[PDB]
Amino acid sequence: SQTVHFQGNPVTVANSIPQAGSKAQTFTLVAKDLSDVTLGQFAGKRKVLNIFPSIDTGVSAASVRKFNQLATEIDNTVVLCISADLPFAQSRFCGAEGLNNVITLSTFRNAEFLQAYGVAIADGPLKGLAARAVVVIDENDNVIFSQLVDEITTEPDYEAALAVLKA
Amino acid sequence: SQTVHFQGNPVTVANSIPQAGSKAQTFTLVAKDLSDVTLGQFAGKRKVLNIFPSIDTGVSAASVRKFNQLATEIDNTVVLCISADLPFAQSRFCGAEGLNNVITLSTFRNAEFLQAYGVAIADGPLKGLAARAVVVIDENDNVIFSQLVDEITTEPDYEAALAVLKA
Numbered sequence: 584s585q586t587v588h589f590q591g592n593p594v595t596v597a598n599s600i601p602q603a604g605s606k607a608q609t610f611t612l613v614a615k616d617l618s619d620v621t622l623g624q625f626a627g628k629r630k631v632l633n634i635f636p637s638i639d640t641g642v643s644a645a646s647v648r649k650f651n652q653l654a655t656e657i658d659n660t661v662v663l664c665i666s667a668d669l670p671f672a673q674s675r676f677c678g679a680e681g682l683n684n685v686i687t688l689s690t691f692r693n694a695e696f697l698q699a700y701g702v703a704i705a706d707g708p709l710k711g712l713a714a715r716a717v718v719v720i721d722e723n724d725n726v727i728f729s730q731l732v733d734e735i736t737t738e739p740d741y742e743a744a745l746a747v748l749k750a
Numbered sequence: 751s752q753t754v755h756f757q758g759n760p761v762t763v764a765n766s767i768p769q770a771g772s773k774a775q776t777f778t779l780v781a782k783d784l785s786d787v788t789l790g791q792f793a794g795k796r797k798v799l800n801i802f803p804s805i806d807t808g809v810s811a812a813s814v815r816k817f818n819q820l821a822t823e824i825d826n827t828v829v830l831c832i833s834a835d836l837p838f839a840q841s842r843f844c845g846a847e848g849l850n851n852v853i854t855l856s857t858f859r860n861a862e863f864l865q866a867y868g869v870a871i872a873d874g875p876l877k878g879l880a881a882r883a884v885v886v887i888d889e890n891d892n893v894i895f896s897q898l899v900d901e902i903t904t905e906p907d908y909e910a911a912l913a914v915l916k917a
Binding site for chain 1: 780783784785804806807834835836839842858859875876877878879
């Protein structure tokens with residue numbers, strides 16, 4: 584298992600975040616219209632997965648705002664904002680701020696994504712929520728970057744996520 | 751199973767809502783502070799369970815506002831607002847409106863409550879969400895009222911829920 588921190592206090596996260604050079608595991612998540620979305624639906628594109636505990640807490644919103652803007656600066660990529668929030672909470676946020684580039688996806692019917700992607704908080708009050716994480720996937724569904732954010736109350740390293748998409 | 755409707759279109763709901771005169775099944779749900787709450791923690795009180803698909807959609811908020819006010823007019827009762835929303839969405843709503851009488855509880859780690867209470871939407875886009883329902887439980891954990899709302903876009907019958915608590 585893995586360990587992240589909340590203001591220094593350890594939090595247990597199941598399994599292992601995918602490693603660069605490994606195959607991305609397929610998933611099914613739920614979109615704003617309650618349709619089911621799979622990894623294969625993005626065939627041929629790069630994918631940025633911005634994973635977080637809740638849009639309604641902490642730095643998660645800040646990260647959505649940032650990735651929404653960054654989405655405009657890269658080509659042939661989808662930016663997926665993924666959490667255990669119901670689709671309605673995710674879309675409430677994006678709608679209030681007019682954040683139209685990111686695609687919001689919910690794990691509320693698909694807890695197995697959190698296990699497969701090594702982001703399931705396993706124990707404690709945050710149990711059932713995703714840890715803060717970024718995974719970047721290439722056009723051939725190979726993982727080319729991941730970060731399991733060590734301090735959950737800090738934003739992910741946007742630069743590092745974007746660097747693997749540059750020439 | 752049971753059938754409710756969304757603008758007349760049928761929606762399948764698992765099992766059977768508890769019937770008046772039957773024992774209330776125990777549950778564990780998650781509160782605003784991410785602590786786990788059980789039915790036994792309300793020993794000796796009457797319980798009103800206001801169950802709904804999401805606080806962020808439809809008539810659900812209207813029902814929270816109403817039950818928050820009604821909570822002030824009855825004695826020895828807790829009013830529990832229950833959904834698959836994360837605790838954060840529920841508390842966001844209550845906080846914005848200063849609705850301090852209801853107790854918000856989430857099924858996000860406890861999908862078995864939806865099955866046990868015959869409120870799990872089984873199929874279709876709403877799968878994974880609770881149907882709109884009210885269950886009232888007495889001081890001895892006997893069910894004294896339930897309503898599985900036939901048209902999910904209409905509010906529950908507040909009067910009927912409250913009538914079983916009167917002399």
